[PDB]
Design a protein around this ligand. Structure first.
Ligand SMILES: O=P(O)(O)O[C@H]1[C@@H](OP(=O)(O)O)[C@@H](OP(=O)(O)O)[C@@H](OP(=O)(O)O)[C@@H](OP(=O)(O)O)[C@H]1OP(=O)(O)O
Ligand SMILES: [Mg+2]
Ligand SMILES: [Mg+2]
Ligand SMILES: [Mg+2]
Ligand SMILES: [Mg+2]
Ligand SMILES: [Mg+2]
Lengths: 290, 107, 222, 299, 49, 34
RNA sequence: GUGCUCGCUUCGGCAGCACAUAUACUAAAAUUGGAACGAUACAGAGAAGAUUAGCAUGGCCCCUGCGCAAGGAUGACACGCAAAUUCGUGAAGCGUU
RNA sequence: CGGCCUCCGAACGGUAAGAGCCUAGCAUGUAGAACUGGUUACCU
């Protein structure tokens, strides 16, 4: 059995009011992954929002570093597969019954020897947040998660409970959509979760700077410079990132053309700066010159 | 492990619930001032009125019935008096109905 | 309802408990079911106590329906309490009951042989049911903590499951010899074959134990 | 040592010393008054009883012979520290009497601030009222002036008021605090008076025969208020050297009269600190907080 | 700031979960170093003995 | 993972510890003795 | 909604005051998955020539029992190289420095 | 003036043990559900 002090949850899922009232139940339910009994905490998210419940053990949380009910990552907040890929992690948690119960037992025994402060294992050795992860991250609280379900009655017409229909009396979503059927077990293990694939395709279609053909094209064109930048400022953007060989600050077009001394240095600089080199608030467009 | 007073927490919570703004609870080591968090402009325009504090509201209350003479055999609505501006049936209609049939078939 | 929910939760569909709390099979059961469907003294003590109370409350229902009489109710209750032995069959499961049973006989010989001191006859109409009632109430005072323990154990075992991991069963009377030999040859294996070795390679302790058993048979054969 | 005291069931609102520096009195929501011995193990001997409402302010006499204690249930009470027993139940207050003050070194006389809209003057012997200055509204703290001839009070309208006991008019009104004043305490100078107010600022004033007509002297930053609006109280040191304040921030604030610097924001508490008590002899500090216990800090 | 309240336990409620699960025992602790004195030799004759 | 099973032999019994009294042999006397 | 304003103030309303202060695993569902020792059929019982009593040990095997008692075929299961760190003589023949 | 009047009934150990097989039950009643479209110019 687990025993906790509070949930460990996403701010989205925790609610809007600063003042929340929440109930605990000791040994209340069984972790859908750890398979063992847990303490279950239940809170009312907001006005006219479903009561939510912590749905995974505190150890099953600390292991993969997620929110015990929202299930999304704690820092960035993407599906577990996406975060794993962006951290280039390879999580080896067993699948079959006996092996998984055994692994859970020993992982719990070893997490007993912790400080309760940070995830155990590679989730400390993989906290180097890649710009892909930061780029996919949610920005404001998608609080549409906490509205109630779809009223089978009010979908057939029957929700004769007036306005109190226990579920959102709107149109039912077409079951063909990939974003419909995502079993909890897979969403925790990260094996074929449709939201992960859609978000990954979105991250693949997202703009990133393109590389040139020729090795000798070592002039990099930064578009959208503005006349509040200095040649020394463009340097400080591309100075310690390697070596720069020359800098042409074109004031007749508000752009720049940086000749470097190391191809990998300039490549890392410009790709890492792609539309996001925000110096004095200017959206520069890093590309390889002609 | 805080220990706070009881009438006050429920006062602030109900405030934030029914009015949408509340005296923010951050007890910061940098001395912040009393700032109404949430619907700040609502707190400004409503003068900070709490759901518990009596205040002037000309808001139209929904129309209800009142049959409180308990001698009529099928008369007494008493405390169970329905709201008069209420519907008499709850259902989805022709377009959403066929669409939901199509979805239940698609599933 | 509780006893039927128990029966049907264990998945014993071939049995049913009828309305006077008799348990009856509705098939002829093979061995596997004659075994799977044996019940304990908790189940049966609860069955028989409920049967006594149903007898009592149903005598009262007969009174209230108009079927009998005040006098027939009183004497029928006296009957019930005097003859718990021949109506329930409780003694089968907690045989200490005969304390109570013999007591309710002794009382009845008193009361009867003072009830019918004159023209009053040896017939049925004697219901002065205070004494036997008292007796079975004290019995129940005693039995409720016992049965609450036994039923708590049964329900736990039915909902959690029986613990076959660290049972650690005592050494009783059928395991005295087998245990003596367990511990004797554990001792011998500790003793030299690991603490006076230097037959380094493989100290052959599995063969010194063979010598030990044969020395014993040779002792016995002189 | 830290010496945390416990044994109170609800918030403790008021804690103060024997003017001997011998015994400790604390009180709050639990409707009774606990006493302790300051030295040794800081142990508890006596418990006074009777007050039906919350004990909102306890106040000693200047010898330590009888105890004054303002209760929520419309009443003040004077008791015998000799016995702990009631001598007088000052009734007649038409609402919540929050603040009480016994006249020091004058005739035995009491000023009580209440939530009725009046300040009340009472004599202990007559079982009757002396004077009452109904300004308009609730008065939240009240203290005499060392002549026992002016009476100072602080409430919701932010203008600290002082009445002359003989002309019975608003003698001295002072202004400059942005929100409600919650605490007054006149130093043992008989001159300098300390004012806490939940607008996050503390002020110092001086009642004299002649003052600059605008006697807002020293100003310190740091105190807090929040959704609690608990009553916040201040004190001078025995020497007029350090000002101690509490706040709803769990930090005991110790400042100095001289340089107005932050000598301390001490943590250690769990709930809002409502009252800090200075030892009349020692560098001993006692914190009464809403975490249902007390602290005994040594500085 | 949140208000913890513990939910009532129903008196008449049997246990909820199956306790008896068996698994092999975990790995022990990191083996400690064997601090012996150096081994001596057994002649052929002793092993004969 | 605490069971609600129970045993006839785990009922409370002998719930007070006898201590060795003043004359029997208390650790004070044996501390003294020669 | 209740009462009182020495409220308008008629006995229509309005107002003010007081009093009263936050239920709920929201579902009649809709889902989703596994067992019945039941058939079905196969299957088919330790030791040693034969016939048979048992008590144990081991553990990702259970079942009946309140059970730390007892029972379940001695409850079942438990055997084809159950080979592990590691060699050297004696002679001969052939080719080599 | 004598009195002396035990007990009492049920279970287990005989009706093999097993793999498949397939369908009720019986359990679940959840968690989650989505977001756009930037480009070249001077001297031989
Ligand atoms: O059946 P039992 O438990 O033994 O009780 C009966 C009975 O009592 P109920 O009236 O409650 O049935 C008889 O009572 P009567 O025939 O007197 O009305 C009778 O007792 P008597 O001896 O006095 O007749 C008889 O006894 P027996 O078979 O010896 O006649 C016997 O009571 P016992 O316990 O006396 O046998
Ligand atoms: Mg044989
Ligand atoms: Mg056995
Ligand atoms: Mg046999
Ligand atoms: Mg066996
Ligand atoms: Mg047998």
């Amino acid at each position: 059995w687990e025993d906790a002090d509070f949930p460990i949850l996403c701010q989205t899922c925790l609610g809007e009011n600063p003042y929340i009232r929440m109930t605990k139940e000791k040994y209340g339910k069984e972790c859908k992954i750890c398979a063992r009994p847990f303490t279950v905490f239940r809170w009312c998210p907001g006005v006219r929002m479903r009561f939510k419940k912590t749905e995974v053990c505190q150890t099953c949380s600390k292991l993969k570093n997620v929110c015990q009910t929202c299930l999304l990552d704690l820092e960035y907040g993407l599906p577990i597969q996406v975060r794993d890929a962006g951290l280039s992690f390879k999580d080896d948690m067993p699948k079959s019954d006996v092996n998984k119960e055994y692994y859970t037992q020993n992982m719990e025994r070893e997490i007993s020897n912790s400080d309760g402060t940070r995830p155990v294992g590679m989730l400390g050795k993989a906290t180097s947040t890649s710009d892909m992860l930061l780029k996919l991250a949610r920005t404001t609280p998608y609080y549409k998660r906490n509205r109630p379900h779809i009223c089978s009655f009010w979908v057939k017409g029957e929700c004769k409970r007036g306005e109190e229909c226990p579920y959102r009396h709107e149109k039912p979503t077409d079951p063909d959509d990939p974003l419909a059927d995502q079993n909890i077990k897979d969403r925790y293990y990260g094996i074929n979760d449709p939201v992960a694939d859609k978000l990954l395709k979105r991250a693949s279609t997202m703009p990133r700077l393109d590389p040139p053909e020729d090795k000798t094209i070592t002039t990099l064109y930064v578009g959208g410079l503005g006349d509040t930048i200095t040649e020394t400022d463009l340097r400080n953007h591309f100075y310690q990132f390697g070596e720069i060989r020359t800098i042409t600050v074109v004031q007749r077009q508000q752009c720049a053309f940086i000749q470097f001394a190391t191809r990998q240095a300039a490549e890392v600089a410009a790709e890492k700066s792609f539309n996001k080199l925000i110096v004095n608030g200017r959206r520069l467009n890093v590309k390889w010159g002609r | 492990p805080a220990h706070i007073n009881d009438f006050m927490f429920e006062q602030q919570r109900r405030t934030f619930a029914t009015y949408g703004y509340a005296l923010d609870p951050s007890l910061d080591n940098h001395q912040v001032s009393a700032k109404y968090i949430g619907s700040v402009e609502e707190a400004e325009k409503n003068q900070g009125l709490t759901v518990f504090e009596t205040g002037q509201k000309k808001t139209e209350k929904r129309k209800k019935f009142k049959e409180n003479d308990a001698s009529n055999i099928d008369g007494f609505l008493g405390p169970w008096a329905k709201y008069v501006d209420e519907k008499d049936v709850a259902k989805p209609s022709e377009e959403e109905q066929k669409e939901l049939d199509e979805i239940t078939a698609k599933r | 309802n509780m006893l039927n929910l128990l029966i049907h939760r264990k998945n014993l569909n071939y049995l049913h408990l009828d309305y006077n709390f008799n348990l009856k099979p509705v098939k002829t059961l093979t061995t596997k079911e004659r075994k799977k469907s044996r019940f304990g003294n908790a189940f049966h003590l609860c069955r028989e106590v409920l049967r006594l109370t149903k007898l009592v409350v149903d005598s009262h229902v007969q009174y209230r329906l108009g079927n009998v009489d005040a006098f027939q109710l009183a004497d029928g209750l006296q009957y019930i309490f005097a003859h718990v032995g021949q109506l329930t069959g409780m003694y089968r499961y907690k045989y200490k009951l005969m304390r109570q049973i013999r007591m309710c006989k002794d009382l009845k010989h008193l009361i009867y042989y003072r009830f019918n001191t004159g023209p009053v006859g040896k017939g049925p109409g004697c219901g002065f049911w205070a004494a036997g009632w008292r007796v079975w109430l004290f019995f129940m005072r005693g039995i409720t903590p016992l049965l609450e323990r036994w039923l708590g154990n049964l329900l736990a075992r039915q909902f959690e499951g029986r613990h076959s991991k660290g049972v650690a069963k005592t050494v009783t009377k059928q395991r005295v010899e087998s245990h003596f030999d367990l511990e004797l040859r554990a001792a011998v294996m500790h003793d030299i074959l690991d603490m006076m070795p230097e037959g380094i390679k493989q100290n052959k302790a599995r063969t010194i134990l063979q010598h030990l058993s044969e020395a014993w048979r040779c002792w016995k054969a002189n | 040592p830290i010496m945390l005291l416990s044994g109170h069931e609800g918030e403790v609102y008021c804690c103060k010393f024997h003017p001997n520096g011998s015994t400790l009195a604390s009180a709050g929501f639990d409707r009774l008054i606990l006493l302790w011995n300051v030295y040794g193990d800081c142990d508890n001997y006596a418990t006074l009883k009777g007050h039906s409402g919350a004990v909102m302010e306890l106040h000693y006499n200047t010898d330590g012979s009888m105890l004054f204690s303002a209760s929520t249930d419309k009443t003040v009470a004077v008791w015998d520290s000799e016995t702990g027993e009631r001598v007088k139940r000052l009734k007649g207050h038409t609402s919540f009497v929050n603040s009480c003050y016994p006249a020091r070194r004058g005739p035995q006389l009491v000023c009580t601030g209440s939530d009725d809209g009046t300040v009340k003057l009472w004599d202990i012997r007559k079982k009757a009222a002396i004077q009452t200055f109904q300004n308009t509204y609730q008065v939240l703290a009240v203290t005499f002036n060392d002549t026992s001839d002016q009476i100072i009070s602080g409430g919701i309208d932010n203008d600290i008021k002082v009445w002359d006991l003989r002309q019975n008019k608003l003698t001295y009104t002072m202004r400059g605090h942005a929100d409600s004043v919650t605490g007054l305490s006149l130093s043992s100078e008989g001159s300098y008076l300390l004012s806490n107010a939940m607008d996050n600022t503390v002020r110092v004033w001086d009642v004299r025969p002649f003052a600059p007509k605008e006697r807002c002297v020293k100003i310190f930053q740091g105190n807090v208020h929040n959704f609690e609006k608990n009553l916040l109280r201040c004190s001078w040191s025995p020497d007029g050297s350090k000002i101690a304040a509490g706040s709803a921030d769990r930090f005991v604030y110790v400042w100095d009269t001289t340089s107005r610097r932050i000598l301390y924001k001490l943590p250690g508490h769990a709930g809002s600190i409502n009252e800090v008590a200075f030892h009349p002899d020692e560098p001993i500090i006692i914190s009464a907080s809403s975490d249902k216990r007390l602290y005994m800090g040594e500085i | 700031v949140i208000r913890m309240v513990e939910m009532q336990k129903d008196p008449m409620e049997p246990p909820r979960f199956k306790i008896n699960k068996k698994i092999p025992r975990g790995p022990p602790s990191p083996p400690a170093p064997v601090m012996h004195s150096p081994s001596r030799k057994m002649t052929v004759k002793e092993q004969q003995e | 993972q605490l069971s609600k099973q129970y045993s006839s032999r785990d009922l409370p019994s002998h719930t007070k510890i006898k201590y060795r009294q003043t004359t029997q042999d208390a650790p004070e006397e044996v501390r003294n003795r020669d």
